[PDB]
Amino acid sequence: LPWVEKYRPETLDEVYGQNEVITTVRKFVDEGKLPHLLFYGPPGTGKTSTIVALAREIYGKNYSNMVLELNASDDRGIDVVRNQIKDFASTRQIFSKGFKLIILDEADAMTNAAQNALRRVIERYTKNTRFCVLANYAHKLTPALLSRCTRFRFQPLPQEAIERRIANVLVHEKLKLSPNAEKALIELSNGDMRRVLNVLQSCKATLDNPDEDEISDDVIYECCGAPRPSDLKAVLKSILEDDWGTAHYTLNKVRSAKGLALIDLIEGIVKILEDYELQNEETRVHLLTKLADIEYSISKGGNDQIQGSAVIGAIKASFENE
Amino acid sequence: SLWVDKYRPKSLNALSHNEELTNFLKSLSDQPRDLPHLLLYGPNGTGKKTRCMALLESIFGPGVYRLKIDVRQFVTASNRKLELNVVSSPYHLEITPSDMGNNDRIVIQELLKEVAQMERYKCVIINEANSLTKDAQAALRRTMEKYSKNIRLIMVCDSMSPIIAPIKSRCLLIRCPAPSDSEISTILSDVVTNERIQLETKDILKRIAQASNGNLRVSLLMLESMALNNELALKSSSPIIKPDWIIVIHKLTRKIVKERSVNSLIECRAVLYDLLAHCIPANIILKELTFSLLDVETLNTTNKSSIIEYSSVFDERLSLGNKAIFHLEGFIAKVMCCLD
Amino acid sequence: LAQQPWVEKYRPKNLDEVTAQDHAVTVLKKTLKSANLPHMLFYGPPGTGKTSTILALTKELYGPDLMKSRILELNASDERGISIVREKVKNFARLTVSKPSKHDLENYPCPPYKIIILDEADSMTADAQSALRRTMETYSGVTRFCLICNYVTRIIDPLASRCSKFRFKALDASNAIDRLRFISEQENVKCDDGVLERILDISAGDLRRGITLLQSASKGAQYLGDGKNITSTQVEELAGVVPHDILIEIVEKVKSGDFDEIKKYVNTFMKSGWSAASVVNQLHEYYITNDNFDTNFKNQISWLLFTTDSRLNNGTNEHIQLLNLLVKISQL
Amino acid sequence: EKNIALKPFDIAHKMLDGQIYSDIGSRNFTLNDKIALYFDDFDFTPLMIQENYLSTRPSVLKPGQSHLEAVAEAANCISLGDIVEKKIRSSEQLWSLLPLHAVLSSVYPASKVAGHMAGRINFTAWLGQNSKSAKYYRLLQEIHYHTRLGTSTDKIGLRLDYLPTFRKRLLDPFLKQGADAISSVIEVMDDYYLTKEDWDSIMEFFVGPDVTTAIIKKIPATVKSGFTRKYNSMTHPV
Amino acid sequence: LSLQLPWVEKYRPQVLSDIVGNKETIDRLQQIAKDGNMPHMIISGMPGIGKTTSVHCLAHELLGRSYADGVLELNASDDRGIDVVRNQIKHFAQKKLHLPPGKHKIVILDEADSMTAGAQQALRRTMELYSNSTRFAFACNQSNKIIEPLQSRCAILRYSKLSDEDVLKRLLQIIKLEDVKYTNDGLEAIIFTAEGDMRQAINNLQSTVAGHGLVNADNVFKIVDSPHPLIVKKMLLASNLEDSIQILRTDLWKKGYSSIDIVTTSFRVTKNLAQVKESVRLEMIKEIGLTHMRILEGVGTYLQLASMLAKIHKLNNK
Ligand SMILES: Nc1nc2c(ncn2[C@@H]2O[C@H](COP(=O)(O)OP(=O)(O)O)[C@@H](O)[C@H]2O)c(=O)[nH]1
Ligand SMILES: Nc1ncnc2c1ncn2[C@@H]1O[C@H](COP(=O)(O)OP(=O)(O)O)[C@@H](O)[C@H]1O
Ligand SMILES: Nc1ncnc2c1ncn2[C@@H]1O[C@H](COP(=O)(O)OP(=O)(O)O)[C@@H](O)[C@H]1O
């Protein structure tokens, strides 16, 4: 079983960092006045966790008879899932507690279906169905009829809560994680719990001895497919200190052997340089402008070697300002 | 007819310049069954189309010159019927998909599929291959892979850079440099001896070759115009005849150099509007204006460097723009500021 | 008889024929020993043997006969876009796995799954890769994916986490030159001294492009008809590479600094038909790796070349851009 | 009703007024007001600004800055705005860039050359010139289709190179020989499948010293009548 | 938990008198309705300004009752196919029903600019065939995408973005029609967030009333999913580039705000920075727009925002 499903909390009391939204939803449900719900925000914040917790709080052992979780981006088709929803709506149960609880995960990826099918689904089944809509990215929600819901924005979880959850997962899975690996995973996921769990499970899979070996930051970076800070720091040091030939050779060798794209190398170098102490602000201005220009040109194509040498020259010229 | 078309070489034996390329084409025509896809790139008016037609004549015979033209109607998506002019022979086809703009891809796909279904093989000559969209080029590569048995493409372009890498790897690169002044002079001498044109000296032909800047079509047409203007008797003092748009652009350059003011800019705008309204491309206008400005002897190095920099900037803006007069006027204003 | 490209003609048949990828080959052998084959992510420099190794692994898994019925080779750079590739993948996955014959079962393991090989995966956008991940998790039971790319960092984290990653080292120049020499000997291609080295240098170590250029040079030599050896000028011509003499003349004209002389030389040069982008690339290669220029000159010229390349990539007039670049370099 | 046509004129006159760009005038008429002026008519305001920004006497010139530098900066900004407009109109869902186009095509260039209108606010000439260019390109396409089997060139090459020689072969003989050149002109036309309509269209493509309107008018009417009668009296290749 | 209707749908303009913006076009439409003559109409304007809503108001004023089949709205880019839409239009136009002498069946074709030459010609022929029975209304983002034959036999109307005064008037009317407690700063914030978008402003007002009741700046910006204008103003007006970068990294980028929202709010704040000289504001707006174009072309990275801040600082400090 996936770790996302396995460690999803079974009760509302186990949700961390969203106390205001938890209290509001609890007040709504405890009185039997559950309205249409819309949960939007960054991924991996606990939307599905909250909905399953409230569903199990309402019904309990017979929650499977009333709830129905469907993915909007399913390859089966929007028409097929619409027919599935219409078939589930016609279902009748002896108990009158609650309503039809349909969960539409990632419903924002409906650039045509939101106005085509979602409007009809929301309108026609008002009498006996409560709808939940989940969104991750910006406002793709077609506000024309989206207003018929209770908006709820999820904020990224605090780092302490993420660390505690990671420790709980480690002690449950009998996994040992280095502190550097934990820091790298937290930085890469940037509050996305789905990414944390998926990377942890995959890294455990790659271990030859899951119960004995320790997951290092190298394993985390290999699993995530992200540039290691050590490689970026080495490239930056070679560019700043060594002459042009050595810097060019080092940059090409590192970003070809390690499979780092030039745009990702630029992003990592910028991230590292943001922490540098520079006496002259003209250095920062030149660095930012030239690197943004190079990245924009890279997006359009162009010559790769020329762009790499342009990055090296831009960094050198900017740091010539001390 | 015109001397440029009457004396066009109709066979590989009638070619006079680029002897090595002629030998290469003869060797290619020696084995018709193994003919690869070809991509001829070089300066304009150097003989690429003539050499392609000569190779086609060497392979199939003189019947390739019995050309007939037709209009093919393609019903694309949304039911927007489009008309494309196709020049066809009993042995080959010639298309210019860039005439359809962004709709070149579907036209290429449909026409190539139809030709493959109709069929040893039929040669398709695509003109202005460098101006094809990237999607059209990908479709062309796909049709090369699918229908290599019955389709042998002969693409002609002025620059190989816009061509994508898969097309380059799937074709044979043929470079066609512009002829030297001596070869152009020899060709013009042959033309004037055939037409019985009096010449005081061959230096007239040398000057025509120099003024044509290696463009053989331009040199031939200039020679015909000079002969017509001089009662079929060219003298050493005979002035070089230039096209109307080139004369207008030179006058505009002299005007820009002489005076730099807002009223001069307005009159330059009027001149540019006149040039653009009569099917003179914006890039051509910009290139001619820049290279006329750079030829002024009164300008110093700094002025010329500023002019070429502004020309590069506004050429990039022309390639990315929609209204050409805007970019041309901006370039002229920048040049006026840099000169003043 | 049909004609086949030399790239696909000389692909290694089995895993033991891969020369300079011993680490990835060993890891793939260990995975093949296991009954379960996870999703794979082959990344490394171009022309190192990623496609060759995945094809060899497939051939060992299914056998020469069943291989063609279990493989869907797709390219992510398809101009038709995300929809066509994803629909093709879905159609391939939906179709039931073909039943292997008795001979295939008894001679080869014939695993129940089917392998989908996707090339240039890093060129996909984030949305395309997310859709690919959704399809992969939908049909994980039947289809195992293998993404081939040059940069693993261009693949989103959710998609990369699902794939075991194999890193291919860049081929040593000796190994690439030996492979090219073996191909030339097998195909009876006459070459002068240093021609294969020039081919590798033009291809920038990419053995795929090197083999393609070698085949093109062989075709050109056959068309020449004299039976003489292939020379460096021919392979430079076929790859669109400006001769070194013209580049040296350009460098000298830039060094002299006279605007009129540079303009005249550029006007003469544009009549020879050489590509301006090749000139810019070779000027970059010459100037950046030259020990006779100080740090400031290279700092300025890198930006100059970058600006010229960016303007050339927009589809502009080559003459104007080249003249501007040369004039700007001459002013340093 | 007819004030819709005057609306772009009023917008251009208000946006080129130098009072609203001073320190005191900026407070009364803020930048939001100027962008709203653009959005009052977003189809004609950039065209009117590009047309009329050279007819002003600037009162907002910086010290040490001449009128020519201001108009050059305005033209640079107008070119950038044209690029932005092309990017906006190429693909939809990019209409969020409309304020940026407003600033780049209407507000900023007016800021650089704001002052007193030297003459009158003239309507944009780009629309008529664009229609004229489209008509002449259609005529050139028809001529190229007619002459494609005899000439080895593209449409642009036909315009730039072949047309002067066609003029020398089809109009100069009339001038230098009266009606005796009708047979030669008809032969040259038949060698390229040129009709009388194509002959009329060809002479309209010439600019500068090569304009042919006055020259054609000066040709005697008897010569033209004989030319058309002889053309209509014989069959021609198709 | 009971039957509810959103304020956007409840207070949508049902008649011509309910429309606040574009007073000249509204006056022309009112004159047309009063005259009792309905000709073919074409409305052109930037998308999202409710062009078809004015046509709906005109149809409501003219037809009155019998609104079931008298008015039909279809999308020119409907996924069902252009041919299907054209056949439906022909069937509806050929279907005649008893109507007053001055009234005719109205067919509205939204996004008609995306149609091709052949489809437009076929629809023009269909409209001319049923001219006396059905009047054709076309809504286009730009009038240049509609062929000249359609333009010649249609009345062209120009629709523009609503001004801030019209949005404020509509919001005040909605507040009066509801039980809304509001303050000046809250309405100013709502108008600031919705740049002439009436529907967005109404949705934001309804959400604020539902969530917090009282309408003030803090509640409005808590409801709105865009960066807070005070934070963006502090980032833009910081005298030190490092402070601007720090604010961008902490309060905007790490808070989950997308780059598009960041550049849009930066444009909005710079446009209204009354304490800065207008030339500096124009330079900053130019830089913000350049980075907005770069983001919309695909490069929605943090480096572009940092470079935008660097250029703005360079302009500010000269
Ligand atoms: N006599 C002679 N004329 C040539 C030769 N090559 C080209 N030309 C002339 O050059 C003119 C234009 O060449 P063209 O086919 O348009 O070449 P392209 O436009 O560069 O592809 C033709 O009309 C020919 O008359 C040659 O080898 N000999
Ligand atoms: N606030 C939270 N408290 C505890 N666990 C959480 C919280 N948010 C997310 N998680 C963990 O993240 C995993 C998946 O998160 P999920 O709710 O699927 O993300 P999304 O919000 O995108 O649906 C769950 O297994 C859950 O244990
Ligand atoms: N390790 C190797 N040993 C021998 N030949 C190789 C090796 N790697 C690549 N090649 C050559 O490269 C060609 C195919 O390259 P390919 O593997 O498609 O490049 P990529 O690694 O980009 O997929 C084959 O013809 C093969 O001969």
XYZ file of N, CA and C in Angstrom, chain B residues 24 27-28 31 34-36 41-43 105 109 135 138-139 142 159-161 169 172-173 175-178 181 213-214 286-287 290-291 294-295 301 304-305 308-309 311-313 315-316 319-320, chain C residues 77-80 212 216 219-220 222-225 237-240 257 259-260 263 267 270-278 307 310-311 313-321 323-324 327-328 331:
282
model
N 29.351 16.812 -59.272
C 28.625 16.113 -58.216
C 27.199 15.791 -58.645
N 27.243 12.959 -61.157
C 27.444 11.688 -60.470
C 26.172 11.234 -59.765
N 25.448 12.170 -59.146
C 24.182 11.823 -58.507
C 23.168 11.319 -59.526
N 23.141 7.513 -60.923
C 22.468 6.430 -60.205
C 21.112 6.933 -59.731
N 19.184 5.336 -56.447
C 19.690 5.596 -55.105
C 19.706 7.082 -54.765
N 18.848 7.872 -55.397
C 18.865 9.318 -55.193
C 18.482 9.664 -53.760
N 19.323 10.376 -53.019
C 18.967 10.775 -51.656
C 18.101 12.028 -51.658
N 21.519 24.930 -50.227
C 21.511 26.199 -49.516
C 22.624 27.091 -50.042
N 22.334 28.387 -50.130
C 23.283 29.355 -50.621
C 22.647 30.714 -50.829
N 23.421 31.665 -51.343
C 22.874 33.001 -51.602
C 21.833 32.973 -52.710
N 1.862 22.945 -42.587
C 2.040 21.577 -42.114
C 0.980 20.629 -42.662
N 1.404 17.582 -45.359
C 1.018 16.219 -45.012
C 0.048 15.646 -46.038
N 6.793 22.864 -36.914
C 5.839 21.766 -37.040
C 5.803 21.233 -38.466
N 8.871 19.119 -38.929
C 8.715 17.812 -38.298
C 7.820 16.903 -39.131
N 6.730 17.452 -39.673
C 5.873 16.669 -40.558
C 6.626 16.244 -41.811
N 8.772 13.354 -40.881
C 7.944 12.162 -40.734
C 7.568 11.582 -42.091
N 19.376 29.572 -46.450
C 20.192 29.388 -45.256
C 19.772 28.096 -44.575
N 20.754 27.287 -44.179
C 20.482 26.006 -43.541
C 20.190 26.125 -42.051
N 20.427 27.289 -41.446
C 20.236 27.427 -40.002
C 18.804 27.162 -39.551
N 20.101 15.568 -40.903
C 20.683 14.232 -40.855
C 20.048 13.305 -41.883
N 20.997 15.287 -47.696
C 22.367 15.529 -48.125
C 22.574 17.031 -48.267
N 23.539 17.571 -47.529
C 23.804 19.002 -47.559
C 24.621 19.360 -48.793
N 26.155 22.729 -50.710
C 26.446 24.151 -50.593
C 26.663 24.742 -51.979
N 25.982 25.854 -52.259
C 26.019 26.507 -53.567
C 26.518 27.934 -53.392
N 27.831 28.149 -53.403
C 28.354 29.513 -53.291
C 28.023 30.343 -54.520
N 27.911 31.650 -54.306
C 27.651 32.562 -55.407
C 28.837 32.571 -56.368
N 33.231 36.923 -59.831
C 33.024 37.957 -60.839
C 33.485 37.503 -62.218
N 26.893 42.073 -57.030
C 27.240 41.473 -55.740
C 27.042 39.959 -55.758
N 27.454 39.330 -56.856
C 27.411 37.889 -56.973
C 26.060 37.299 -57.314
N 15.264 47.158 -44.637
C 16.192 47.401 -43.539
C 17.622 47.057 -43.935
N 17.817 45.916 -44.599
C 19.160 45.517 -45.005
C 19.754 46.513 -45.994
N 20.561 49.833 -44.223
C 21.735 49.717 -43.368
C 23.018 49.683 -44.185
N 23.041 48.898 -45.263
C 24.268 48.791 -46.041
C 24.497 49.991 -46.950
N 26.067 52.394 -44.188
C 27.441 52.011 -43.884
C 28.413 52.337 -45.010
N 27.922 52.655 -46.204
C 28.783 52.982 -47.332
C 29.031 54.477 -47.480
N 33.883 55.772 -37.700
C 33.743 54.404 -37.209
C 32.647 54.294 -36.154
N 29.148 54.295 -37.708
C 28.851 53.042 -38.395
C 28.598 51.910 -37.405
N 29.363 51.866 -36.311
C 29.128 50.851 -35.288
C 27.755 51.020 -34.650
N 25.115 49.811 -37.210
C 24.994 48.361 -37.346
C 24.371 47.751 -36.093
N 24.675 48.304 -34.914
C 24.046 47.810 -33.691
C 22.536 48.033 -33.715
N 20.733 48.419 -36.346
C 20.202 47.558 -37.394
C 19.970 46.147 -36.880
N 20.922 45.607 -36.119
C 20.740 44.279 -35.540
C 19.545 44.252 -34.593
N 19.440 45.264 -33.728
C 18.348 45.304 -32.756
C 17.000 45.346 -33.469
N 16.314 44.601 -36.580
C 16.063 43.402 -37.369
C 15.497 42.291 -36.498
N 16.059 42.111 -35.298
C 15.463 41.168 -34.357
C 14.029 41.560 -34.029
N 11.753 40.621 -36.948
C 11.449 39.194 -36.988
C 10.398 38.811 -35.952
N 10.289 39.578 -34.868
C 9.348 39.295 -33.792
C 8.123 40.200 -33.805
N 9.288 14.495 -28.339
C 9.388 15.704 -29.143
C 8.437 15.701 -30.334
N 7.401 14.865 -30.300
C 6.425 14.826 -31.380
C 5.739 16.180 -31.514
N 5.673 16.685 -32.748
C 5.091 18.003 -32.978
C 3.596 18.021 -32.693
N 2.925 16.874 -32.824
C 1.487 16.828 -32.579
C 1.153 17.061 -31.110
N 26.212 8.819 -37.837
C 25.428 9.411 -38.918
C 26.320 10.172 -39.894
N 27.027 9.430 -43.862
C 26.862 10.469 -44.874
C 28.148 10.674 -45.667
N 28.517 7.842 -48.124
C 27.657 8.066 -49.284
C 28.250 9.117 -50.215
N 28.767 10.209 -49.649
C 29.386 11.236 -50.472
C 30.612 10.735 -51.210
N 31.139 7.608 -52.117
C 30.635 6.766 -53.197
C 30.163 7.612 -54.372
N 29.493 8.731 -54.089
C 29.060 9.617 -55.163
C 30.225 10.328 -55.838
N 31.351 10.500 -55.143
C 32.508 11.136 -55.767
C 33.027 10.302 -56.932
N 33.068 8.981 -56.765
C 33.351 8.068 -57.848
C 34.813 7.740 -58.063
N 32.308 19.824 -44.787
C 31.278 20.312 -45.697
C 29.930 19.666 -45.409
N 29.922 18.359 -45.146
C 28.666 17.654 -44.925
C 28.016 18.021 -43.598
N 28.792 18.492 -42.626
C 28.262 18.897 -41.332
C 27.985 20.390 -41.244
N 28.214 21.138 -42.318
C 28.027 22.578 -42.281
C 28.997 23.299 -41.371
N 40.740 45.520 -36.673
C 39.812 46.487 -36.128
C 39.246 47.494 -37.105
N 36.789 49.011 -39.513
C 35.377 48.740 -39.765
C 35.131 48.397 -41.229
N 35.735 49.155 -42.147
C 35.490 48.931 -43.568
C 36.026 47.579 -44.019
N 33.646 44.919 -42.730
C 32.404 44.918 -43.498
C 32.604 44.287 -44.869
N 30.821 40.871 -46.177
C 30.059 40.859 -47.421
C 30.560 39.773 -48.362
N 29.475 36.253 -46.845
C 28.067 35.890 -46.963
C 27.725 35.352 -48.346
N 28.581 35.586 -49.339
C 28.354 35.066 -50.680
C 28.779 33.613 -50.836
N 29.515 33.054 -49.878
C 29.959 31.671 -49.976
C 28.949 30.677 -49.420
N 27.891 31.147 -48.764
C 26.824 30.283 -48.307
C 27.038 29.613 -46.967
N 28.153 29.874 -46.290
C 28.385 29.277 -44.982
C 27.366 29.783 -43.967
N 26.992 28.900 -43.044
C 26.010 29.244 -42.025
C 26.613 30.193 -40.997
N 25.864 31.244 -40.653
C 26.343 32.206 -39.665
C 26.355 31.620 -38.259
N 25.391 30.751 -37.941
C 25.358 30.134 -36.619
C 26.596 29.278 -36.383
N 27.047 28.562 -37.414
C 28.285 27.801 -37.296
C 29.470 28.724 -37.047
N 24.387 37.312 -26.981
C 23.408 38.198 -27.601
C 23.257 37.898 -29.086
N 21.308 34.664 -29.475
C 19.899 34.866 -29.156
C 19.177 35.580 -30.289
N 19.830 36.568 -30.906
C 19.204 37.269 -32.021
C 19.115 36.381 -33.258
N 18.762 33.092 -33.225
C 17.748 32.070 -32.995
C 16.339 32.577 -33.277
N 16.155 33.890 -33.386
C 14.843 34.466 -33.649
C 14.490 34.493 -35.129
N 15.371 34.010 -36.001
C 15.103 34.021 -37.425
C 15.309 35.387 -38.043
N 16.537 35.886 -37.983
C 16.880 37.222 -38.446
C 17.843 37.133 -39.626
N 18.254 38.300 -40.115
C 19.189 38.371 -41.230
C 20.592 38.027 -40.745
N 21.189 36.995 -41.343
C 22.490 36.516 -40.886
C 23.586 37.543 -41.134
N 23.518 38.252 -42.262
C 24.557 39.217 -42.608
C 24.663 40.313 -41.553
N 23.527 40.903 -41.177
C 23.532 42.006 -40.221
C 24.037 41.536 -38.863
N 23.539 40.388 -38.393
C 23.952 39.878 -37.090
C 25.440 39.558 -37.063
N 27.840 40.804 -39.006
C 28.613 42.039 -39.071
C 28.616 42.756 -37.729
N 27.459 42.821 -37.066
C 27.392 43.467 -35.760
C 28.261 42.743 -34.742
N 31.987 43.420 -35.534
C 32.345 44.800 -35.220
C 32.440 44.996 -33.713
N 31.502 44.416 -32.960
C 31.545 44.540 -31.508
C 32.771 43.847 -30.924
N 35.979 45.843 -31.270
C 36.091 47.025 -30.425
C 36.616 46.717 -29.029
